[PDB]
Amino acid sequence: TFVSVAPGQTARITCGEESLGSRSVIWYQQRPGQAPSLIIYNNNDRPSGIPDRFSGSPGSTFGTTATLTITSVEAGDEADYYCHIWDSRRPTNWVFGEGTTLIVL
Amino acid sequence: QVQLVQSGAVIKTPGSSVKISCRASGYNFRDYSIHWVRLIPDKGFEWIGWIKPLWGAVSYARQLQGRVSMTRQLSQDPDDPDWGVAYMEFSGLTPADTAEYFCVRRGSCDYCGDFPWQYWGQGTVVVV
Amino acid sequence: QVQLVQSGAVIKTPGSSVKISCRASGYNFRDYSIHWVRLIPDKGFEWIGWIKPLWGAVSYARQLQGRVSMTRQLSQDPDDPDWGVAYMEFSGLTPADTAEYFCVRRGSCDYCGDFPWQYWGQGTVVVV
Amino acid sequence: QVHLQESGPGLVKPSETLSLTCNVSGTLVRDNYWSWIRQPLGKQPEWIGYVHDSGDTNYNPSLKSRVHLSLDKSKNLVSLRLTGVTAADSAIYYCATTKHGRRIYGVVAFKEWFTYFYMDVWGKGTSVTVSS
Amino acid sequence: IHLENVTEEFNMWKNNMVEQMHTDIISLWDQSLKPCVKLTPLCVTLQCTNVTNNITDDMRGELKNCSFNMTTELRDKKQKVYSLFYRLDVVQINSNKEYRLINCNTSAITQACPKVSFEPIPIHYCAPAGFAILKCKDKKFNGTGPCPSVSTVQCTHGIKPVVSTQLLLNGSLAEEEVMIRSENITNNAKNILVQFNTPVQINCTRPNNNTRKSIRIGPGQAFYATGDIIGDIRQAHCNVSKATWNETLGKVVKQLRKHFGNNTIIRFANSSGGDLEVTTHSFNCGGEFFYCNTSGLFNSTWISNNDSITLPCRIKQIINMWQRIGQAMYAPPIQGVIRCVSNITGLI
Ligand SMILES: *[C@@H]1O[C@H](CO)[C@@H](O[C@@H]2O[C@H](CO)[C@@H](O[C@@H]3O[C@H](CO[C@H]4O[C@H](CO[C@H]5O[C@H](CO)[C@@H](O)[C@H](O)[C@@H]5O)[C@@H](O)[C@H](O[C@H]5O[C@H](CO)[C@@H](O)[C@H](O)[C@@H]5O)[C@@H]4O)[C@@H](O)[C@H](O[C@H]4O[C@H](CO)[C@@H](O)[C@H](O)[C@@H]4O[C@H]4O[C@H](CO)[C@@H](O)[C@H](O)[C@@H]4O[C@H]4O[C@H](CO)[C@@H](O)[C@H](O)[C@@H]4O)[C@@H]3O)[C@H](O)[C@H]2NC(C)=O)[C@H](O)[C@H]1NC(C)=O
Ligand SMILES: *[C@@H]1O[C@H](CO)[C@@H](O[C@@H]2O[C@H](CO)[C@@H](O[C@@H]3O[C@H](CO[C@H]4O[C@H](CO)[C@@H](O)[C@H](O)[C@@H]4O)[C@@H](O)[C@H](O[C@H]4O[C@H](CO)[C@@H](O)[C@H](O)[C@@H]4O[C@H]4O[C@H](CO)[C@@H](O)[C@H](O)[C@@H]4O)[C@@H]3O)[C@H](O)[C@H]2NC(C)=O)[C@H](O)[C@H]1NC(C)=O
Ligand SMILES: *[C@@H]1O[C@H](CO)[C@@H](O[C@@H]2O[C@H](CO)[C@@H](O[C@@H]3O[C@H](CO[C@H]4O[C@H](CO)[C@@H](O)[C@H](O)[C@@H]4O)[C@@H](O)[C@H](O[C@H]4O[C@H](CO)[C@@H](O)[C@H](O)[C@@H]4O)[C@@H]3O)[C@H](O)[C@H]2NC(C)=O)[C@H](O)[C@H]1NC(C)=O
Ligand SMILES: *[C@@H]1O[C@H](CO)[C@@H](O[C@@H]2O[C@H](CO)[C@@H](O[C@@H]3O[C@H](CO)[C@@H](O)[C@H](O[C@H]4O[C@H](CO)[C@@H](O)[C@H](O)[C@@H]4O)[C@@H]3O)[C@H](O)[C@H]2NC(C)=O)[C@H](O)[C@H]1NC(C)=O
Ligand SMILES: *[C@@H]1O[C@H](CO)[C@@H](O[C@@H]2O[C@H](CO)[C@@H](O[C@@H]3O[C@H](CO)[C@@H](O)[C@H](O[C@H]4O[C@H](CO)[C@@H](O)[C@H](O)[C@@H]4O)[C@@H]3O)[C@H](O)[C@H]2NC(C)=O)[C@H](O)[C@H]1NC(C)=O
Ligand SMILES: *[C@@H]1O[C@H](CO)[C@@H](O[C@@H]2O[C@H](CO)[C@@H](O[C@@H]3O[C@H](CO)[C@@H](O)[C@H](O)[C@@H]3O)[C@H](O)[C@H]2NC(C)=O)[C@H](O)[C@H]1NC(C)=O
Ligand SMILES: *[C@@H]1O[C@H](CO)[C@@H](O[C@@H]2O[C@H](CO)[C@@H](O[C@@H]3O[C@H](CO)[C@@H](O)[C@H](O)[C@@H]3O)[C@H](O)[C@H]2NC(C)=O)[C@H](O)[C@H]1NC(C)=O
Ligand SMILES: *[C@@H]1O[C@H](CO)[C@@H](O[C@@H]2O[C@H](CO)[C@@H](O[C@@H]3O[C@H](CO)[C@@H](O)[C@H](O)[C@@H]3O)[C@H](O)[C@H]2NC(C)=O)[C@H](O)[C@H]1NC(C)=O
Ligand SMILES: *[C@@H]1O[C@H](CO)[C@@H](O[C@@H]2O[C@H](CO)[C@@H](O)[C@H](O)[C@H]2NC(C)=O)[C@H](O)[C@H]1NC(C)=O
Ligand SMILES: *[C@@H]1O[C@H](CO)[C@@H](O[C@@H]2O[C@H](CO)[C@@H](O)[C@H](O)[C@H]2NC(C)=O)[C@H](O)[C@H]1NC(C)=O
Ligand SMILES: *[C@@H]1O[C@H](CO)[C@@H](O[C@@H]2O[C@H](CO)[C@@H](O)[C@H](O)[C@H]2NC(C)=O)[C@H](O)[C@H]1NC(C)=O
Ligand SMILES: *[C@@H]1O[C@H](CO)[C@@H](O[C@@H]2O[C@H](CO)[C@@H](O)[C@H](O)[C@H]2NC(C)=O)[C@H](O)[C@H]1NC(C)=O
Ligand SMILES: *[C@@H]1O[C@H](CO)[C@@H](O[C@@H]2O[C@H](CO)[C@@H](O)[C@H](O)[C@H]2NC(C)=O)[C@H](O)[C@H]1NC(C)=O
Ligand SMILES: *[C@@H]1O[C@H](CO)[C@@H](O)[C@H](O)[C@H]1NC(C)=O
Ligand SMILES: *[C@@H]1O[C@H](CO)[C@@H](O)[C@H](O)[C@H]1NC(C)=O
């Protein structure tokens, strides 16, 4: 679950079950010793404060897996990532996916 | 011949619902309409409605809508294409609904319309 | 409509043997002939051979015999009588065999001959 | 500007009815939905559920009975009550608001849509540990 | 060619050539089945369950995952195969759950060959030598009695065969007025045909993406069945334009009041009941049937003084159209996402 990239490069972090219907993916990240922190709340939407280049997979693609594209990474990007998928077909995921840690050189 | 066997008399409570069957035999049941009609003494006749058994296409009298229900059962086998059962489930009984009921079939000539009812049931009297 | 889907380009070693499929759809596949033809730059076209898929009766060009091999596969079901796959296994490759290949079908009029090739594949270039 | 303040004992005996409270900062408890999240160490979190007044009080159907979420509009706090602390119940717990949204894929009048959730802000935590 | 100074009485109600046409269409319908394949080995115990979906406990899904034993190419080999079916074609037999097809207690069943289509083509009827065909070229003609404007013909014009239990589709439309026709309007059980002037569009679709699956029954046999469903599990429906429907109903209410008193209140109701395919209008679209609820249309009233209308459908596979005695028909599942657009022409 460990992905290492050079700082300033691109990275892809995948999580969760393959798509069955339309989905609403939600991305959290977790610095060590903190609370969680939202980055992406819709399929490809972000709130204020978080910068760009945190791309997400569009929710209409059928039979793919939730991805998170971070281009021009940094050491402040060193945090655990969490998918939260909301399929229209599968039931409510009361637990999250798997925590993949993004570590940088 | 045309045979129209109803069921016998029955006594029901007010506010109840009665179910009169009508078994028809001797003809192609899929081809002719079935009319339900009634008789109250000192009121004359009153038309209730009709049903086509090919799809069960119904039509009710207006002043009794919501209260009456007509269904049918075809006979599906390659041996008996003749007999078929009409029903009538009449709901919301009053003592004024005490009456004699009939299931009838029209005449089969070319100038026969639909309401000149040729063949008649033996009549079923229900008292509330 | 007549659709002639080939396969894409490929690079092979000298002395090897390439295999090009040609899937034909939109017509009765058992009824018409299939010709293969080639294009080397600064050489013009060169005929290769033909195949009737009804039995797969083939005929080859003389100066390439012993090298080319044509087969076919029909569609056998009562649902899809249209599509059929011709093949070409070209053996004994040289770099001079670097060329663009075509599977073609003739015209369907009454005065249409056999070589006036109406329908054409999209072209498959092989470089050795 | 909000920040939430969890509060609980931290060291809990087994088979004990646990409760936690959550203090607010600025935004009153009426205005927004409320939610609790647990997380074991080195694990993914489990969203325990959400609470709000007027029927918006759904639970995780995993436990679904031994947990009771509530609000305090008089004191402006968020209350959790629990029943039967077990060994796996040792986890860090979080009070947090959430915001909904209608993910819609077809004819709205045919219920061809649903409501996602996302916890916009977070708490600070309380390391509940079960022992004897 | 036209004919003059001529008075001819017509009748559509004591007319023939609808009788033998109703014969001939069902005759050609049966001619389109004797090449096709029976499903006599298919009536078998079905282990069915709910389709993979977030299920609502109070509403119901309309797709069932059914696994069952089936023969193979070879006799001694049996196999386990699954497919999907609508709720409206299986019933429960009797703990566990086991279903079966509804026709398999009472009739045989035939798959349609997926070669043949079900779109209409225009049929021109013609008469042999020694007969002639007449045509009333009058503008206003309620359907009975003399017609001064007539002309002979050798062959009838384009007639596309549709199947619609209500709301006759893609038909020929009137010249200027909206016309209503009957045999005896004061008789009620006789129907009323409503040929309205301007066509009104309908969209109809099933939005679900549909995969088929071939199943070999035996030696050289075939069978098609609904395999996987990719995407959002949605519900088929139809749409019409709101204001067009309002204006056309205004036109027909304008035309009705000649017959029923000028100061008359006219309203509408949904149909009373009966079979599933007479409570709706029942049509075919892309070679697949629809039974689609019509209560969102006939619910209005009328006084003597960007939106649409959506309406939900249902999809059956096995039919008994014209209500035969032991004859049924399976309909093959078709790929993709199906929509079609039709000009609504008349009413019944
Ligand atoms: C018969 O008639 C009936 C009705 O009479 C027809 O029924 C209709 O059928 C259509 C088609 O089936 C349905 O369309 C879907 O609509 C939903 C809802 O769309 C509305 O909401 C959108 C989002 O809401 C946000 O904005 C609104 C204000 O706009 C705000 O109030 C709200 O709170 C929220 O903040 C609006 O954007 C949308 O507007 C769109 O359409 C307007 C129409 O004119 C146009 O003006 C706008 O500019 C805009 O284009 C509308 O208000 C849609 O959500 C849905 O589309 C999504 O889902 C499908 C599923 O496959 C997907 O293919 C689409 O691409 C789209 O998914 C994108 O958006 C998701 C949003 O989260 C995102 O998660 C996805 O990942 C994806 O995002 C990707 O692409 C976008 C760019 O598109 C990009 O920004 C992303 O970053 C990412 O790259 C469908 O379009 C109708 O709901 C339905 N009912 C009604 C009442 O209309 C019926 O079809 C007729 N039948 C026939 C046969 O004709
Ligand atoms: C009222 O009247 C209207 C007017 O005709 C009528 O609408 C028409 O309906 C028919 C059937 O629903 C439509 O026909 C289908 O059209 C699609 C689209 O392709 C056509 O259109 C494009 C652009 O307009 C053209 O470029 C193209 O050449 C076509 O003309 C076709 O895909 C359909 O073809 C498939 O079905 C046929 C049925 O047998 C097959 O013969 C055909 O080969 C195709 O099937 C094959 O491919 C499938 C996909 O892989 C596969 O699953 C099959 O098994 C098979 O292998 C078909 O031609 C027509 O387009 C509609 N008209 C318009 C203008 O849209 C209404 O239906 C009518 N109302 C009622 C109730 O009937
Ligand atoms: C053709 O199309 C028309 C309209 O498109 C359909 O008409 C509607 O049909 C439904 C049912 O067939 C009618 O009944 C409604 O059912 C709803 C579902 O009931 C379930 O859920 C409730 C709780 O939500 C439970 O109590 C119940 O036991 C069921 O489990 C009800 O929720 C509806 O109630 C609503 O309206 C009433 C009256 O206004 C309110 O008091 C309620 O609070 C609630 O808001 C209702 O009972 C529905 O009424 C029909 N519409 C109209 C306008 O009459 C036809 O059914 C369709 N044809 C066919 C054959 O299906
Ligand atoms: C998968 O499908 C399930 C179907 O059960 C779906 O669960 C339901 O989702 C809705 C919305 O997400 C839940 O919330 C409802 O929302 C409305 C709108 O505010 C409220 O008014 C509702 O309250 C009423 O219903 C309550 C329960 O019946 C009553 O207690 C209350 O007094 C009101 O009458 C309600 O809060 C809804 O609770 C759930 N249902 C269940 C059983 O969980 C789920 O969201 C879908 N998931 C996905 C990913 O698609
Ligand atoms: C209709 O019902 C049938 C019932 O047989 C159903 O077929 C079965 O579905 C399940 C789930 O879709 C299939 O199980 C999968 O099989 C594939 C192929 O072997 C595996 O790759 C899958 O593994 C994934 O999921 C696992 C879950 O833990 C993961 O651990 C793993 O890493 C993979 O991500 C999974 O085991 C099963 O094979 C089919 N059986 C057949 C014969 O097809 C069908 O899907 C239902 N269809 C519909 C439309 O409802
Ligand atoms: C498809 O066909 C197979 C083959 O007939 C069916 O499998 C058989 O099903 C019966 C009853 O479901 C099984 O009997 C039971 O077996 C269990 C397991 O051993 C046993 O505990 C019970 O006491 C009882 O004996 C039978 O063993 C089983 N045979 C095989 C080879 O699987 C199957 O049910 C059919 N349907 C599907 C959906 O597969
Ligand atoms: C449908 O329309 C046709 C005409 O296009 C109607 O046919 C004719 O209608 C007139 C009046 O509507 C009838 O005239 C009446 O005749 C009697 C006796 O001749 C007379 O006493 C009356 O005062 C009146 O003038 C005429 O009979 C009728 N022709 C036929 C053959 O019936 C037709 O009536 C319309 N359909 C229905 C069901 O009404
Ligand atoms: C014509 O309109 C009437 C009134 O809107 C429709 O009657 C309604 O039909 C629905 C469907 O049955 C009734 O819903 C209820 O469904 C539950 C499901 O379990 C069932 O338990 C109830 O007994 C009842 O069936 C609804 O009550 C009923 N309304 C009235 C006033 O009778 C009718 O369906 C429409 N016609 C067509 C063809 O749709
Ligand atoms: C064949 O069997 C089916 C199911 O066993 C019968 O269908 C149901 O029969 C029951 C009475 O046994 C009725 O209450 C249901 O309404 C029927 N359902 C349907 C969809 O028709 C069917 O009647 C039987 N047919 C014959 C000719 O025996
Ligand atoms: C039916 O099955 C037979 C045998 O399984 C197929 O015949 C062989 O198929 C293989 C490919 O699977 C070829 O390499 C052989 O050359 C074939 N042999 C012969 C004698 O034809 C046959 O192609 C299958 N047919 C269909 C329509 O599926
Ligand atoms: C329905 O789903 C199928 C799933 O295969 C879609 O077919 C794929 O479409 C994409 C893009 O059009 C192609 O790249 C794939 O090669 C297709 N796969 C196959 C097996 O054909 C199909 O497009 C979907 N239809 C709709 C209307 O969304
Ligand atoms: C038929 O039309 C009437 C009125 O046009 C519809 O009545 C609606 O009834 C609901 C009751 O739940 C009200 O909330 C709506 O305001 C009424 N509509 C209007 C326009 O006032 C009735 O629903 C229609 N029938 C169907 C099946 O939809
Ligand atoms: C349904 O009927 C309408 C009647 O207007 C047709 O629309 C016209 O059709 C003719 C010939 O088909 C065209 O020359 C016109 O350009 C059409 N008018 C418009 C505004 O497009 C329509 O084609 C018919 N068929 C369908 C499928 O809608
Ligand atoms: C199966 O279908 C029944 C009845 O439709 C439903 O109650 C149940 O929730 C469905 N799912 C499962 C897993 O049993
Ligand atoms: C009914 O109205 C029409 C015009 O709408 C009028 O020509 C006709 O005379 C009226 N009939 C009666 C009986 O008033």
PDB file of N, CA and C and ligand atoms in Angstrom, chain E residues 58-59 270 276 279 293-296 310-312 314, ligand 3:
ATOM      1  N   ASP E  58     -39.188  -1.702   1.010  1.00  0.00           N
ATOM      2  CA  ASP E  58     -40.599  -1.422   0.790  1.00  0.00           C
ATOM      3  C   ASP E  58     -40.982  -1.383  -0.678  1.00  0.00           C
ATOM      4  N   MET E  59     -40.123  -0.850  -1.539  1.00  0.00           N
ATOM      5  CA  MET E  59     -40.317  -1.018  -2.965  1.00  0.00           C
ATOM      6  C   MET E  59     -39.706  -2.346  -3.393  1.00  0.00           C
ATOM      7  N   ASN E 270     -58.417   7.224 -15.595  1.00  0.00           N
ATOM      8  CA  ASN E 270     -57.641   6.071 -16.010  1.00  0.00           C
ATOM      9  C   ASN E 270     -58.570   4.888 -16.240  1.00  0.00           C
ATOM     10  N   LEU E 276     -53.343  -6.697 -17.829  1.00  0.00           N
ATOM     11  CA  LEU E 276     -52.222  -5.773 -17.761  1.00  0.00           C
ATOM     12  C   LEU E 276     -52.014  -5.045 -19.076  1.00  0.00           C
ATOM     13  N   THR E 279     -54.880  -2.306 -19.424  1.00  0.00           N
ATOM     14  CA  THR E 279     -54.836  -1.164 -18.509  1.00  0.00           C
ATOM     15  C   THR E 279     -53.892  -0.079 -18.999  1.00  0.00           C
ATOM     16  N   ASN E 293     -47.587   2.661 -18.059  1.00  0.00           N
ATOM     17  CA  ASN E 293     -48.746   3.188 -17.336  1.00  0.00           C
ATOM     18  C   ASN E 293     -49.177   4.543 -17.881  1.00  0.00           C
ATOM     19  N   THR E 294     -50.489   4.714 -18.036  1.00  0.00           N
ATOM     20  CA  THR E 294     -51.043   5.869 -18.726  1.00  0.00           C
ATOM     21  C   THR E 294     -51.889   6.747 -17.817  1.00  0.00           C
ATOM     22  N   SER E 295     -51.775   6.590 -16.500  1.00  0.00           N
ATOM     23  CA  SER E 295     -52.627   7.366 -15.609  1.00  0.00           C
ATOM     24  C   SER E 295     -52.220   8.824 -15.542  1.00  0.00           C
ATOM     25  N   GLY E 296     -51.007   9.154 -15.954  1.00  0.00           N
ATOM     26  CA  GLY E 296     -50.602  10.536 -15.999  1.00  0.00           C
ATOM     27  C   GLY E 296     -51.157  11.337 -17.149  1.00  0.00           C
ATOM     28  N   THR E 310     -44.128  12.687 -17.885  1.00  0.00           N
ATOM     29  CA  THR E 310     -43.389  11.441 -17.820  1.00  0.00           C
ATOM     30  C   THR E 310     -44.325  10.357 -17.324  1.00  0.00           C
ATOM     31  N   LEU E 311     -44.083   9.132 -17.762  1.00  0.00           N
ATOM     32  CA  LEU E 311     -44.915   8.029 -17.312  1.00  0.00           C
ATOM     33  C   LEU E 311     -44.149   6.714 -17.352  1.00  0.00           C
ATOM     34  N   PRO E 312     -44.255   5.910 -16.297  1.00  0.00           N
ATOM     35  CA  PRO E 312     -43.379   4.751 -16.139  1.00  0.00           C
ATOM     36  C   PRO E 312     -43.908   3.502 -16.819  1.00  0.00           C
ATOM     37  N   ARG E 314     -43.259  -0.913 -17.878  1.00  0.00           N
ATOM     38  CA  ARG E 314     -42.820  -2.224 -17.438  1.00  0.00           C
ATOM     39  C   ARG E 314     -42.505  -3.052 -18.670  1.00  0.00           C
TER      40      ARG E 314
HETATM   41  C1  LIG F   3     -50.120   4.429 -12.867  1.00  0.00           C
HETATM   42  O1  LIG F   3     -49.481   5.631 -12.464  1.00  0.00           O
HETATM   43  C2  LIG F   3     -50.103   6.284 -11.348  1.00  0.00           C
HETATM   44  C3  LIG F   3     -49.350   7.570 -11.122  1.00  0.00           C
HETATM   45  O2  LIG F   3     -48.225   7.669 -11.984  1.00  0.00           O
HETATM   46  C4  LIG F   3     -50.086   5.370 -10.128  1.00  0.00           C
HETATM   47  O3  LIG F   3     -50.838   6.026  -9.112  1.00  0.00           O
HETATM   48  C5  LIG F   3     -50.272   5.990  -7.793  1.00  0.00           C
HETATM   49  O4  LIG F   3     -50.138   4.647  -7.281  1.00  0.00           O
HETATM   50  C6  LIG F   3     -49.737   4.509  -5.909  1.00  0.00           C
HETATM   51  C7  LIG F   3     -49.647   3.026  -5.644  1.00  0.00           C
HETATM   52  O5  LIG F   3     -49.924   2.286  -6.826  1.00  0.00           O
HETATM   53  C8  LIG F   3     -50.766   5.208  -5.034  1.00  0.00           C
HETATM   54  O6  LIG F   3     -50.572   4.985  -3.638  1.00  0.00           O
HETATM   55  C9  LIG F   3     -49.471   5.628  -2.968  1.00  0.00           C
HETATM   56  O7  LIG F   3     -48.557   4.661  -2.468  1.00  0.00           O
HETATM   57  C10 LIG F   3     -47.436   5.179  -1.695  1.00  0.00           C
HETATM   58  C11 LIG F   3     -46.564   4.016  -1.288  1.00  0.00           C
HETATM   59  O8  LIG F   3     -47.142   3.404  -0.150  1.00  0.00           O
HETATM   60  C12 LIG F   3     -46.094   2.731   0.573  1.00  0.00           C
HETATM   61  O9  LIG F   3     -45.490   3.617   1.491  1.00  0.00           O
HETATM   62  C13 LIG F   3     -46.378   4.173   2.489  1.00  0.00           C
HETATM   63  C14 LIG F   3     -45.571   5.161   3.296  1.00  0.00           C
HETATM   64  O10 LIG F   3     -44.910   6.028   2.380  1.00  0.00           O
HETATM   65  C15 LIG F   3     -46.982   3.031   3.332  1.00  0.00           C
HETATM   66  O11 LIG F   3     -47.927   3.564   4.239  1.00  0.00           O
HETATM   67  C16 LIG F   3     -47.670   2.006   2.403  1.00  0.00           C
HETATM   68  O12 LIG F   3     -48.183   0.921   3.165  1.00  0.00           O
HETATM   69  C17 LIG F   3     -46.728   1.518   1.295  1.00  0.00           C
HETATM   70  O13 LIG F   3     -45.738   0.729   1.951  1.00  0.00           O
HETATM   71  C18 LIG F   3     -47.970   5.971  -0.491  1.00  0.00           C
HETATM   72  O14 LIG F   3     -46.884   6.549   0.209  1.00  0.00           O
HETATM   73  C19 LIG F   3     -48.900   7.073  -0.998  1.00  0.00           C
HETATM   74  O15 LIG F   3     -49.379   7.834   0.084  1.00  0.00           O
HETATM   75  C20 LIG F   3     -49.122   9.217  -0.218  1.00  0.00           C
HETATM   76  O16 LIG F   3     -50.334   9.874  -0.527  1.00  0.00           O
HETATM   77  C21 LIG F   3     -51.322   9.860   0.525  1.00  0.00           C
HETATM   78  C22 LIG F   3     -52.577  10.496  -0.023  1.00  0.00           C
HETATM   79  O17 LIG F   3     -52.243  11.799  -0.481  1.00  0.00           O
HETATM   80  C23 LIG F   3     -50.754  10.608   1.748  1.00  0.00           C
HETATM   81  O18 LIG F   3     -51.690  10.555   2.810  1.00  0.00           O
HETATM   82  C24 LIG F   3     -49.420   9.956   2.186  1.00  0.00           C
HETATM   83  O19 LIG F   3     -48.858  10.669   3.283  1.00  0.00           O
HETATM   84  C25 LIG F   3     -48.426   9.839   1.020  1.00  0.00           C
HETATM   85  O20 LIG F   3     -47.980  11.169   0.757  1.00  0.00           O
HETATM   86  C26 LIG F   3     -50.042   6.497  -1.815  1.00  0.00           C
HETATM   87  O21 LIG F   3     -50.801   5.707  -0.917  1.00  0.00           O
HETATM   88  C27 LIG F   3     -50.802   6.676  -5.425  1.00  0.00           C
HETATM   89  O22 LIG F   3     -51.752   7.368  -4.623  1.00  0.00           O
HETATM   90  C28 LIG F   3     -51.205   6.808  -6.891  1.00  0.00           C
HETATM   91  N1  LIG F   3     -51.224   8.206  -7.285  1.00  0.00           N
HETATM   92  C29 LIG F   3     -52.340   8.936  -7.303  1.00  0.00           C
HETATM   93  C30 LIG F   3     -52.184  10.363  -7.724  1.00  0.00           C
HETATM   94  O23 LIG F   3     -53.429   8.465  -6.994  1.00  0.00           O
HETATM   95  C31 LIG F   3     -50.719   4.026 -10.473  1.00  0.00           C
HETATM   96  O24 LIG F   3     -50.544   3.121  -9.389  1.00  0.00           O
HETATM   97  C32 LIG F   3     -50.084   3.427 -11.727  1.00  0.00           C
HETATM   98  N2  LIG F   3     -50.757   2.196 -12.102  1.00  0.00           N
HETATM   99  C33 LIG F   3     -50.386   1.000 -11.640  1.00  0.00           C
HETATM  100  C34 LIG F   3     -51.186  -0.168 -12.122  1.00  0.00           C
HETATM  101  O25 LIG F   3     -49.452   0.870 -10.858  1.00  0.00           O
END
